[PDB]
Design a binder for this molecule. Sequence first.
Ligand SMILES: Nc1ncnc2c1ncn2[C@@H]1O[C@H](COP(=O)(O)OP(=O)(O)OP(=O)(O)O)[C@@H](O)[C@H]1O
Ligand SMILES: Nc1ncnc2c1ncn2[C@@H]1O[C@H](COP(=O)(O)OP(=O)(O)OP(=O)(O)O)[C@@H](O)[C@H]1O
Ligand SMILES: [Mg+2]
Ligand SMILES: [Mg+2]
Ligand SMILES: [Zn+2]
Ligand SMILES: [Zn+2]
Lengths: 155, 155, 260, 260
Amino acid sequence: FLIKPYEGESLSHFLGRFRRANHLSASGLGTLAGIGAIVARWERFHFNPRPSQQELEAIASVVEVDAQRLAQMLPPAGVGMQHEPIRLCGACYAESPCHRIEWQYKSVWKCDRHQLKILAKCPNCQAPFKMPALWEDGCCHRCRMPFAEMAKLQK
Amino acid sequence: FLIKPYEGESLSHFLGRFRRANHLSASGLGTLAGIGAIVARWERFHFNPRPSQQELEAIASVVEVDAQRLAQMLPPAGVGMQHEPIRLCGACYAESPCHRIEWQYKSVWKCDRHQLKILAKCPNCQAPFKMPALWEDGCCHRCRMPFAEMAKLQK
Amino acid sequence: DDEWLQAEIARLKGKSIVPLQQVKTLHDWLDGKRKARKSCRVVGESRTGKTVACDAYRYRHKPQQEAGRPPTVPVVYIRPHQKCGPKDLFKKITEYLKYRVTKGTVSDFRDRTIEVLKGCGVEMLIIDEADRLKPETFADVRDIAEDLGIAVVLVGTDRLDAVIKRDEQVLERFRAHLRFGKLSGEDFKNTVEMWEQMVLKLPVSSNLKSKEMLRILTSATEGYIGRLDEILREAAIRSLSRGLKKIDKAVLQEVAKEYK
Amino acid sequence: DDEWLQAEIARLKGKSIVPLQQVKTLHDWLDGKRKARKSCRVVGESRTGKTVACDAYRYRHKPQQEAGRPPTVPVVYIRPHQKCGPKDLFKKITEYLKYRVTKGTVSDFRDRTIEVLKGCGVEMLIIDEADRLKPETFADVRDIAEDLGIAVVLVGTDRLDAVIKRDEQVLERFRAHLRFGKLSGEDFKNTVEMWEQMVLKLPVSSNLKSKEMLRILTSATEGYIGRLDEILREAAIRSLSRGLKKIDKAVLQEVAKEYK
Ligand SMILES: Nc1ncnc2c1ncn2[C@@H]1O[C@H](COP(=O)(O)OP(=O)(O)OP(=O)(O)O)[C@@H](O)[C@H]1O
Ligand SMILES: Nc1ncnc2c1ncn2[C@@H]1O[C@H](COP(=O)(O)OP(=O)(O)OP(=O)(O)O)[C@@H](O)[C@H]1O
Ligand SMILES: [Mg+2]
Ligand SMILES: [Mg+2]
Ligand SMILES: [Zn+2]
Ligand SMILES: [Zn+2]
């Protein structure tokens, strides 16, 4: 089962969404692509050894999304990002149910489209968000508030 | 019952082979050596906390193989390895019935001696190999193909 | 006419909810327990109609959501699967409230479920098939009913009573019950006629549920609402498949002997 | 001629499916239960021919796949192994639909199986040898039939009835049955003659299933279709191995005494 990426979707979110569509573990996707543990590293936003051309093309062969498009699920060259905290604009999620790579940019604190501060934890119960690959439903894993409803609590 | 290591034998494979010669569980070998659960960790190639001098000497006292020789059952300093997938050269196994630590080196994909791709699962039935400590016989645990015969299916 | 026949068979395949005195007593009792946050346990036979009545009590209070706040769900209905662990149960609680889970430990799921459970102002926790979940989860449901003040109704067959009996606290805390009746009597005849009028939805051929039909259906269903529904639907579909406009005696005899 | 002899022995070793009234009644009943999503349980003796008939009902609705959408499988046939757990059963369900499993917990397998089961639009869940699976899995099959609206047919020997009887819900929910007959009578003689014409596929030597042959086969098979098949195939192979063109009396006597 193939999936079309959402605009701005992060690599972690896309990988997990592909895995859920195919009932794959991270190790299973890694074996399908021939790169093993690299998949789980990318899902946790750990790229000490940045994604190589061969690794991106290996994943591209499985998910049928070109390496160039996969690179747009990561920050451009020179744009610093953070693996933690995982962040969210609930108003964005209501429009398109994905985590955006921009929300991990170190320079980003406000959603430009919605002119709201982005969230660094659930505004109802304060639970931090899991890595985007594990965003199985669109709700806080603790209190079960929908990400779309968190828009109403954004400042 | 003491056993001489095979050249290049991995620590996991050697530990399991010693245990089989003495009808020991991993916990039993750990208690004999005074280090408990560490034995099973090493058998699954888990060394986030690397083997200490005291731990290697504790095992050395039981198996009567010097800590220096036990260290040659692990990669040298600076050589990265993987706990997964467990890999195999069947042509090597036909010559010497052990798992080699080199087959877990991240940089290794071909056997230099035999100029064959090494195997990451049974080439007959695709079953992954167990941790080397559990290689009780020289055959695939699923289809029962001998590891030595898998040489004929290596590419 | 063939399109009409397909519509008829599709409608007969689909089940409906006829409101009768059994479900009326049930949601009256449920409202009484809800107004006091009294945790009870409705018990009954199998294939008798408890799940449908609890479902009706669930839909009647359809949650009304505010413009920008979580929807307030007064009644929560769950049917945990076989050997449902605590993590699975918490997942189900927070999933019904439309809060997708986040990967984590059992403590994380418990905390998120508690947060979303107080957030939506829930009044009822209806655990149907409450004989499936493990006894390491009854402590969790006990804690929910103890601290969050939510009246929990444990629904299930009579085996649920045996399951809770071997435990100590869950038996004492959940002691109020409402056994589902057999329905046999003149009320049973009223049920047959009311079913004929509503669920069958066939042209009036003056079947009227005569004495012979009542005897056949009494011998067949043994008082079960589910058996009555199955037999009626099977007879209607068999009559409509063979071209018969109404339901004859031969089809009831066939379905009755096929059952017993 | 030796190549012809090898072809004959290979064909005789392989079993076929002669369509007779038993399987005709069976798939008629199965179609009736399928059009209404009615979950029943076909029961019968051992070595009588239920598995082959369910197999025929499986192949007749060979799934027709769209160009780019999952193949729609109306009938699902499973034969779970001894002491089949819930994970094993779910693995089998999603494997028949040609969805290879992914490593995970029992909940993951359940979710994937439910997803692929609604995706392919399945109408039937035929669980042959339904006396093998554990009773912690009958709750799962109950949930499948309850929520996904799939008519489940539990197939197995009479021991399956005893297995389900000790349970509460599975007995009430799965009550419609179709016992397989013994076939003894003139229909049995018709079966012998029809088998001689089709399955034996030997040159016409006017055996005609005479009275003596009928008596021998009645004493041998005791009404079983499987015993009839085994005895006929053994006699044919023994006659062809010793050079006999047709099947003599001595070979039936030998195979009959070898059985009893
Ligand atoms: N109020 C009702 N209106 C219409 N049909 C009903 C009603 N109550 C029960 N039924 C019928 O009962 C059958 C199933 O009932 P239900 O699932 O509620 O059983 P239950 O008492 O909870 O038992 P079990 O625990 O054995 O599942 C269905 O055929 C359904 O149509
Ligand atoms: N319609 C049929 N056409 C041809 N052979 C049949 C038919 N039905 C049954 N048989 C024969 O019956 C034997 C096995 O029958 P089957 O496997 O269906 O049994 P069953 O009734 O399901 O019993 P069991 O549970 O004991 O396996 C085989 O020899 C097979 O050839
Ligand atoms: Mg019920
Ligand atoms: Mg069988
Ligand atoms: Zn936004
Ligand atoms: Zn080699």
